[PDB]
Every structure is written in C-alpha cells, then in structure tokens.
Symmetry: none
Subunit: 137 residues, 8 copies
C-alpha cells in the first residue's frame, strides 16, 4: 500500500530518492509512464501488469482506446531503483510533468504519482470537494 504525501527534490541528474517508507514497496525496478493532469505514475511492474488489464477492458476498435494506449505505453519505461533508493526520471517525462525542483510524491495505494509541487497545489487549489466529486461516482 502506497499512502501519504512526500516533499522531495529533483536531483541534479534528474533523480528522486524514494522516501524510505516507500522503497520498501518497490523492488529494484519500476514502470513510470506519464499520468493524468501532468503527473507521472510509478508502479511495480506487476501492478503495471494489472493496470494494463484495466485498459484492455476498453474496446480498442474504438479510436480513443488506441490513442489512450499509445499515449500511455509510448512514454512508459522500466527504471531501476539504484542502491540508494534513487530513480532516474526520463527526459521526456521530466518535461511532460514540468518537473524542475521540488517534487511531491502522493501514494495512490496501487501506484505512486510524481508531481511538480506548484502544479499539485494548483490542482488541489482548483478541484471540487470530496463530497461533490464522490456524489458523481
């Protein structure tokens, strides 16, 4: 289970050190891919496996399904968690998530999201209430 919020800094070599309470969750490898609202998702390969299983539940004969799958997997990568718990974030992803300095890692149980601190707070700042959003489920 990936839970919580974490404030960390983006390395000079574009790496982020997984907190610690988090390193435990991951093995020596993760899949990254770009997320929604410009955030970058991080999962254990096995979880990515299941995540993809949720996509295939979608038609695929439908153009949108193909665009979604291509946008996701075409920017997805395996990344080894080094001995120090660090992860090198790909150039393409650094840009997609506007990662600069000051990152926010939020646990989403299944996966972990990497945010630019500013963007995340802005997301939170906008964004409707918990009751409002929930009522629409």
């Amino acid at each position: 289970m990936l839970l919580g919020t974490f404030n960390i800094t983006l390395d000079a070599k574009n790496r982020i050190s997984l907190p610690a309470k988090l390193r435990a969750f991951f093995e020596g490898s993760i899949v990254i891919n770009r997320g929604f609202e410009n955030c970058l998702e991080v999962r254990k390969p096995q979880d990515f496996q299941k995540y993809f299983e949720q996509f295939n539940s979608f038609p695929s004969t439908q153009k949108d399904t193909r665009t979604l799958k291509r946008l996701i997997f075409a920017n997805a990568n395996f990344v080894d968690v080094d001995t120090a718990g660090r992860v090198l974030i790909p150039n393409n992803l650094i840009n997609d998530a506007k990662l600069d300095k000051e990152i926010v890692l939020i646990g989403q149980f299944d996966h972990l999201e990497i945010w630019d601190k500013k963007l995340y707070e802005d997301y939170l700042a906008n964004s409707e209430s918990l009751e409002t959003v929930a009522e629409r489920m």
Copy 2:
C-alpha cells in the same frame, strides 16, 4: 464488527484512546485517511485493502475518479496503535476534521469514524430522517 457511538477527548499530543470494545477489533496498526463530511475514517489495513478495491470499479479514465482517489489516498496514513491503545492522529487530518477537544467515535461496522463532537451533532441535527434517506436508495 465496529458498532456504537463513543465520546472521548483528543489528547494533548493529538491522540485518542480506542475505547476498548474497539481495541479488540484493531491489531497494532490502522490506516486513517480523511472521510466524507469532515470525519476521518479508521480501518484495519486489510479492510483498507478491500475499501480501495471498491474504487477500481470506477472509470479512472474519468477526471472525477482521479480527484476522488487523490483526495483520499494522498491523505491516508498507516498509524500504529501504541501499547495503551492510543492512536496519534496526523496534523493534516486533525485540521481536515477540525479536531480540537471532544471527539465522537462511531462504529460503521467496516470502519470507524472520528468526529469533532460539535460537527457530528450538527450533522445529525441537519440530515433527513432514516426513512427518507432510505427510500431514496
């Protein structure tokens, strides 16, 4: 199963002593996270596991689902129940639930909810009848 209403006080160190009939239900660890209507939910990690899986039945390709998942899990945490049955509530959650002094714990079978006494009574004060709400299910 968690049943009942309990009136307790918020510790000076921001902790609450699980009643007793309740300690039984929990092991040495719980997940907390913010609830709906400003209340903080408490569950055994295993139950949190099942609670989460209930979300994955929701689109995910939908913006609202993502907001919901981010408002919940980003504010969820593992908290150890100390030897005395006390649980230390995180700062963020204390504020989200406007927890001050005088808490109300209500058993919701699956989980437990932590309320600010005032807010809860106000919630109960407003809130339609049991029959009215039920008829709409």
Copy 3:
C-alpha cells in the same frame, strides 16, 4: 427450524431496569449475545451477531460515494450495540434506543424471520392502524 425462524407477535413489559425478557420460544433463537440498533418507523431491531453481519453486507451494495448511503449507515450503525442476553433471558435496552423507540411500558415483539423488532405497544398499533393493505403494498413490489 422452529428455533431458526423468528415468527409471531408477543406482548411484554419493559423492566424497571429497562430490560425485556425474551419470550422463550424466542430465547432459543438467540445465543447469549445480540445486536440491537434502531429500526425503521421507531422500532429497534434485534439480531444474532451473525445475522447482523449479513444484514450489513447488504448495505455494501449501496454506493458509499453517495451522501444518502453515508447518512443511512451512520444513522444505523452509530446506534447499534452488542447486548448480552443474561442468564434469565433478559436484554437491557440502551437509553438512547429506549428513547428512539419511545419505549415506556408495554412492548410488542414481532418476529421478522431474520430479526426481531421491539415496539412501543401504542406506536405499533398505530402503525398497523394506518398502513395500507397486504394486497396493496404487495402489488407495489
């Protein structure tokens, strides 16, 4: 069977210490513990913990993301309690529940197969007095 089906109507009195003696044909059904909780139309339900377990699971088929679901669950479980049936088959009804069901003196226990309901005699008779026919209600199912 005859001890696994809660059926019938029973007229009993509320104890001076707020307890009710389970009839007998009924004690059989229950072990040494029951869950009580407030019911609909001001009545208090009584079930074996296991049956309460199943009753609840039915509620998990309800959204939860929906506001009404949360209100329902909160009005029900916040007012539910475990109560031990003493050696004499008596059950002490909590203060809050005594009030919610306007229990005073003269109780009516009706078996609902799954559970048992506790009613203030007056309120129950009024409920029955109002209330549409069996055929009418049924046709709407």
Copy 4:
C-alpha cells in the same frame, strides 16, 4: 392409497376440500393432505383473506423470496411485518387436526365451512363464502395469464 399416489401426495398439494371448522377452532387435514405434512406447519395470513399453510421447510424457501426485496423500502417492511408478525408454528395433532390461532380465524373470517385448496407449494384455508365470491369475481384464466 397406492404407494404411487402416496408418493405424490407427499410431493404436491392439489385439490379442493370442503371441511368444517371445529368447535375448538381446528380443522382436520383431509388425509390425502396429512401425507404431505409432518407434525408441524407454519400458518400465517395470506392474500385475499385466506391463511396459508406450509411445511416449515417450504416456509423457509418462501421467505428467502422476500429477501430479494429492498427492505430500505417502506413497502417491503410493511409486507414483511404484515406477514411474519402473523405467522405461527402449529403442531398437527395425532388426529391430523390443526388448531387455527384466534387472530388468523378472524383475519380470514373463518366461521364454519372451510375450503382448503392445494397450491402445490402450500395450502390455502378459505371461508367457503369468501372463496366462492373470489372465484365469482376474478377474471378468466386466459385474461390473467396474458398479463404475466
């Protein structure tokens, strides 16, 4: 009673029977019917004022049918309360007699002259008059069926 018949009488309740209500409010199960029932039955009030009689097991299955009904719905609760609060276990004595409860005698307007009709699953008890009136009114077999 041939063993072939015996076998079915214990499997299905069929037929119409005219009997009298005892002075002590009992009815003697016909015979072809006693076979179907053990030593205990559940009675409960039925629809159109008729009282139903079932073997406890069958009553068990009958009830599970009601659990597919909401219960958060006020009507469901009324239905369940009108039925089970007026349901009772009754022992079929040695002579095949069943003593019908006061409340049920009144609800079905039972006086003297009863009609027992087998509904396969259960058996219904009617006041002779009420039953014939029910049959007198009541649309045709084809009419009712077409609406199913």
Copy 5:
C-alpha cells in the same frame, strides 16, 4: 423418447360415465395416475404428476406478490386433481372440468409433448379455424 413425448391428434368419445380411454400410444407415457386441471382456451390439460411438478415450477418464477399471479395460480390449482388411470386405460374426468371444457361427446386429444390436452371437437376446430398462421404467431415470439 418414443415413449416420453406426447405427440399427435386423437379423436375419441366421452364415456357415458364421463371417462376417456387413453388411445394406447399414449397410455405408455402415463403411469397409473395423472393430474388434470383446466387449461387455456377451454381445454383441460393432462400430465404425469412429475411433469405437473415441473410445470408448477414454471409458475413460481412469477411474483406472487402480484395479484394476477395469485389469480392465475388459484384458477389453475383449484381445479387440478389427481385421477387414476384405470386398468382399461380410462380416465374419469371430474364434473367441474367436463363443464369448463364443454365436454359432451366427441373429444380431441392433442399431444403437447409435455402434456396432453382434451378438447371438445367443435371448440378445437373452431380454435383452429380462427387462430393466426404458424409464421404469424411465431414471428411474435
């Protein structure tokens, strides 16, 4: 199979004692007892008790909280009876049923696989005389 399917049309006479002799190819299908009950379009149905058992199971799939379901079941089972097939393959048709089907003299037995139907010859031909085509009726299923 060549003895577990009621197929065909048979013209027979109603006994002076209100009985019908099962053809023969038919007797085979039935044991020593049958269930009769009134059918639709005034015809009387005949089944082996086991088949009646299954036929009933097709009804209970119907509400029963619905007034129509109760009327249907009462109209059917209240006129249903067990009838022994005598040594000569004859079946005594109850008075009530004789009247319901306007049975007089000259009966038509049509096999419906599951059951067998008894018709007054006139009424049956009239039914056939009216009645839409096979294609028409079928298209509406």
Copy 6:
C-alpha cells in the same frame, strides 16, 4: 450434421427414401411435424426433445405461445424409418406441405426439411439476400 440440398421423388405410397449420406444421421425413428413456410421438419427424437425445450423458455401464459405449441406438436408424429431407409409421411403433413411428386430435402444441421420442389424454388426466388437477412440479426 445435416447439410445439403437433395432432389427426390415422393413415393406412390407417400414415402421418401432418405438420400444415404442422410440415413446415417438418423436411427430407425424420426419425428416429423409441420415446419414454417409449409415445409415439414424431420429430426431425431433426441433432437426433437431439445427443440421442444427451446419452446419452454417461451411464456406459456401468452396466447401466441399456446397457439405456436398447438400448431406444432399437434401435427408432430413419430415415424419409423423402414429397412430401405424410407419414411412414410402422414396424410395431414403431405397436405400441409403441398407434397405431390418431386421433393427437396435440405439439411439444416439440426434437422432436415421436406419441401415441394416448386414451393421451395419460389421461396428461394423471393426471399432477400444472405447479407440483407443477416444484417437484421
């Protein structure tokens, strides 16, 4: 597996010799009954059993169902396939299918249909295209 089209003649005693490739499929007995569009169907009693169970999924409380069932089964019959592979078609069925001389047997996998050569060709003559009919399924 009953497949194909066969042109045969109606016997003087109202019988048809099952082709041969066909005799194989049937045992020594068949059920005949009138079909749709005036054709007479032929099946193995076992298959007739399954065909009937298909009707039982239909109302029965519906007048049309009862008519359908009465038009089919009242005109169904068991017929023994003699030693020479001949089948004597009942009077009633000969008339319903306007059988005279020159029959067309078409395999329908499940069953076999008997047609008056003229009527069949007319049926085929009219009758929409394969693609047209299929598109409406």
Copy 7:
C-alpha cells in the same frame, strides 16, 4: 498454433476439374475432410467439420421463430457440403458453389483464423477496392 491459425492471402488457380490445391501451410490445418458452404459477399467458406459444428451452434442463439433466422439458416446450410481433401491436398468445389462465387480461373484464399474463404480474384479485389477503411469499420463495432 502455426497450424491452428488460418492466416494470410493465397493466390491459386481453379483446377480444370474444379478443384483447388490447398497451399500447404494450409493443408496442415485441415484433416481429410472439410465443410464448404456459401459465404457472404460471394465467397464460399471452408472449415474443419468441428469448427463448422461451433459455427452453427452460434446460429442457435438466434430465435428461429423469426423469419429472417430461418432464411439465413436455409441459405447457408442448404448450400453446405462435406468435401474430402484428396491425397494431393485438392478439394473439389461443388457446381452450385462454383457458380455462387463466380469461380472461374484465378482464386484467392484468405485465412480468417476460424475458417478459410475462397474468392474469385476479381471479386475479391473489387471488394477490397470498395470497402471502407480499417479504422472506419472498426469504430462502428
């Protein structure tokens, strides 16, 4: 798998005796017998009997009381045939089918996984020439 998957396009000639030699990669797939039947858009389908069995079972999920269902089943099975694949891997195509598919000289066999389709080279190319895009057609599924 490489012999449990009919894939590809094959250009072959129609024999002087109206036969076609199964490519080879294809013979593997088939045993010594196949069912042919006329396909959609004038093409003739070819399957292993077992697969034909499954293909048909799909058609039974269709009413049958519906006129269209009956026409469909009659247009298909009445024109279906068992054909033995000879020692040389040749298959003799029935006269009726040769005509239905306008088979002359120059055939195109396309694998459809489940089955194989036989086309007149011209007709196939025309089909391809017309025919919307892969994306267009797919979006409508």
Copy 8:
C-alpha cells in the same frame, strides 16, 4: 540484464525503440524485446498504419476478442478480412531479426527508420515520420481518457 529485469522483459513489452529497416526488409528486435518473443511471431497490419507484432499465443487471445462481434454484421466481416488476410507467422531468426512481408512494408509505409513501441500485449512497428505525426496530432491524455 538482472534476472528481475529479464523476468519482466519476458512479461511485458514497454518502451520506444528507434531502429533501421534492413536492406532485406528486416528489423533486429532490440534485445530487451527478444526476451519477450520466442522463435516465431504473428505480424498483421494494425490501425493508423502500424503493423502489430505478437507471440502466437497472444495472437490467439487477441482473435478471441473478435468473436464477441456479430459476424452476421457486414462490418465485422470487413474488419476480420482486413486483419487476418494480412496477418502472417514470421520466424525470428537466430540474430533476433524479423523479415517484414512486402505487403506489410507497404501498408505501414516502412522505408528506413522504424519506431517500435511496446503496447504490453503486443508491439507496434511504425514509420518514424508517421509515428511522430500521429503523436504530433492526437489529443491529450486527459481528453482522450475522459471519453472512455
């Protein structure tokens, strides 16, 4: 390749790879990819002019998803004919190379400079230009997703 990496490389196809089309029309599977495939693959033309590559077993599963489609429907038949008539088994040689069929080379406008993108289930082969154009156009991740 750590044994863990190898494990995952044989479980999912991920990543973007830039390679060159051989003079004999072959591509050398990257390496992290060869692990995923055995000695044979099925190719077939994809959507948006891209050619798909799968392990025969996966192609098996891919196809089954198609049988949920009518078939009596003209479009289903066109879809199945446009896909499978242009599908082929291709052996991955000893050097990890795959020779792409003429027809598929043309259908995907393959020339020189190919992009292989892993779609977990399968792998897509693109003409570098066409792929970037596809990416260039193409709405946002959030936008597309919101319509699912």
